[PDB]
Design a protein around this ligand. Sequence first.
Ligand SMILES: N#C/N=C(\NCc1ccc(S(=O)(=O)c2cccc(OC(F)(F)F)c2)cc1)Nc1ccncc1
Ligand SMILES: N#C/N=C(\NCc1ccc(S(=O)(=O)c2cccc(OC(F)(F)F)c2)cc1)Nc1ccncc1
Lengths: 472, 473
Amino acid sequence: EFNILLATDSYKVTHYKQYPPNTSKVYSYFECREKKVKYEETVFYGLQYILNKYLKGKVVTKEKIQEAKDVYKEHFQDDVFNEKGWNYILEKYDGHLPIEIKAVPEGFVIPRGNVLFTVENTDPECYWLTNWIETILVQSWYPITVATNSREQKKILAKYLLETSGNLDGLEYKLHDFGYRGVSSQETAGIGASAHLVNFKGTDTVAGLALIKKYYGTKDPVPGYSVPAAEHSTITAWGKDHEKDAFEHIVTQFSSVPVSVVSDSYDIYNACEKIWGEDLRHLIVSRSTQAPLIIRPDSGNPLDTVLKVLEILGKKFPVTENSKGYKLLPPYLRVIQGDGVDINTLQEIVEGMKQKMWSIENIAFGSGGGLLQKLTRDLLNCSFKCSYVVTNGLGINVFKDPVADPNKRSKKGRLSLHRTPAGNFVTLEEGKGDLEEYGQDLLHTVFKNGKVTKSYSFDEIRKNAQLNIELE
Amino acid sequence: EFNILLATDSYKVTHYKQYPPNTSKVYSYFECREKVKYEETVFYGLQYILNKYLKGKVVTKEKIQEAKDVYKEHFQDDVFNEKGWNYILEKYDGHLPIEIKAVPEGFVIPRGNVLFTVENTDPECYWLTNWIETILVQSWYPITVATNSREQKKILAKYLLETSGNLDGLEYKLHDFGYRGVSSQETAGIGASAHLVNFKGTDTVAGLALIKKYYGTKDPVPGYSVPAAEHSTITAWGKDHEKDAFEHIVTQFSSVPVSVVSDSYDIYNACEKIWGEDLRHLIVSRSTQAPLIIRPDSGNPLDTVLKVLEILGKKFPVTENSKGYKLLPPYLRVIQGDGVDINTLQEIVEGMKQKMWSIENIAFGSGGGLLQKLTRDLLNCSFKCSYVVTNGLGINVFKDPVADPNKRSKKGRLSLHRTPAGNFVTLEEGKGDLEEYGQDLLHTVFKNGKVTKSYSFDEIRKNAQLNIELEAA
Ligand SMILES: N#C/N=C(\NCc1ccc(S(=O)(=O)c2cccc(OC(F)(F)F)c2)cc1)Nc1ccncc1
Ligand SMILES: N#C/N=C(\NCc1ccc(S(=O)(=O)c2cccc(OC(F)(F)F)c2)cc1)Nc1ccncc1
């Protein structure tokens, strides 16, 4: 069973002895710190998961306190654990955390350098608790960053799909999550997959579905979808001389639904030109528009291989020119590039297709490690800092400001998030939100004293995270 | 509760229909595929997966119904192999008819060798081998963390030995700071445990319980820490009271080591004036068992470390060790915990050596660099089918993409062997059977729902030792 007393950085166990004496309040905040491709705005997503799974309800028991005590005695070779402080929460509050958390609504898209949530203790005895839970709350960096990076890729796709086709039809199925095997754990898989689904509807990372169902909720039965597809084992199992037999068997098994077939086991160019393009062409051209063959290269330079596959297919199948002047494969045939795709190569591929006059309608992308694993907390500088304390009954605005790195300076005092007169966002420091010169604080209480006080459905989050181009 | 029918990539739900008719066996293997660095990998983490996810009754009527219901909506179609899963439930009481063979955990093996193999033990379950690819492939993560952590240990060992003449304290020179910087609680535990294969210092408490549950140590815990400040415990005192914060903290932790982050406002002032002058009397009185550890946390990592050491060296009595390198007094050390990864680690220790500072003076903390900034393509961790039996005939299968020879996979039944020179070699096409290379070094670790061979964390650590550690004795 999970024990919140064992879910912090070891050193935090010692901090209750380090704050100034007579400190009744520690108030801290989370931001994606501004830094002097660009990631200028971030999608706030994932806190509700943490609140529900780890923070709410009776999270302290006698047994958990004793367990922590025993572990820390050996871990520190010393007795430093705040057993009294934890027992207080158990006795006074039936083990519920005396903490208030206020947050911007999930799905909200906020520029860098703004407060996204704040945390403070609601009982003076628990001044130490605010930053105890920094570690667990800061892991929100991950769904924020996956959702943000996924959305930035959607912006790239949208721009190029609109340019080459005139519309955004199918945009929400253009970047598929292939990342299940390439992330660090089962738990990460569900979190990351759910964050990508804020922007798209295609996923193979099945763990994302149950997470969304349990913690967020959707009107539709499921938040994400997939279609049948081969992997190398289901092609290569037929033997090297029988690739065509594998292809034939698979497209016939899935004759009436879309099917993707990985075509690079031995020679992608041969497979396209000779196997699909000649030997099995009759099984392709007969397919429904709702059930295309999707040819999947999976190796070589991603741009070069996409362009060469399209060049080959365009000579073996009847290509049209759309109203924008771009080439379009027949509706029973598409391509998916699912190798080496990240935000940078995604851009390179669609720009390269555009240069060669191929519509983005022809292609979808799969992304695995690039989508869910190749991200860190420093990409958006997700960071949690104390900005206000009360000591001897007096509030003081606190902050760090390292001489050699102005980028790490933190905000001062009690914070609030507001709309500016021009409709942008601003974070007011030093309790200036209290002056009421800037309309209502956009932070809402989402957790208080062990209870989740405000929740968002996955549908609401998706609405909040829409692109401007989708809104237009 | 975890449901293995829902723990695969969606497309694998459709694969049972795609294999050749009358296929009775699908046999697959995992390697860290060969491509100048990461030439050898530490095999670690499979035992966790076997125990937590694969062993025992993992199929129930309810889990089958749940998966049926989810996949119906996910695919907008009924493609799920209900019958196949029911067969496992009915015939094997929901235990997986799979056999997995693996190299011992902690073993250090060159790239491009077979690390584990997987095959079905019932012909009806030919589709099961690759169903569990997704979950088994996540072993990439503890393998990669453990390997990258060990590569850092090699750097530290080299420079510690050169500047001090011994390896004392090596296993405490790289501390895990990564708890907040990983992607989940589960990842934190797995990654922290992988780092503990090589070192003993961690703040990622999640790692302790994982090791105790799945591996075990003779000692009460596998890893340790010591008291330390964070910015909030300094800055809460107010900008004009940094000295008061420092004094309070070192007085609270007067007889144990304590680290105090010193860069809240001006690291150089803190070292030269606050520690070096105002509070100097509280430092020089401390025990060798209870040093103050000064922690910079910003700026160029190498430049900041060198400047902090120059400042301290002028305020405190420095000695010259037997190798000719400068050593701070034993009540004073430094920890650099910002911007540390395998690359910057190398730059800092080399820069220190050039300025004649012993590596004894310093320890490193690493967070995202240690536990998060790693992907499956670093060591090209990969699972592939190499052998099938169809119509009663075994055939050796592989991929070999024309545009990427680095993606070629191995053929046939595989085994791992010692060469005459004592190195490793992977034999393909069942050639291990010829018995020209001795016995297969893989061991059956999982069979028909049961874990059949396992390793303690102590054994794993011994297996993962550096050669330099083995040399002496
Ligand atoms: N191809 C593959 N591979 C996988 N999934 C099948 C898969 C995914 C997306 C696409 S698509 O062309 O975007 C598409 C087509 C029609 C409807 C649609 O809509 C929707 F997807 F939502 F159903 C999405 C096709 C087929 N899985 C995979 C996991 C890990 N590693 C490699 C591979
Ligand atoms: N300084 C800090 N910060 C943290 N940990 C305390 C910490 C860690 C290592 C060291 S050391 O100098 O290597 C050391 C000293 C003596 C014995 C020893 O051995 C042993 F490790 F076993 F105690 C290790 C000191 C103090 N936590 C932290 C989490 C996340 N982000 C930033 C910070």
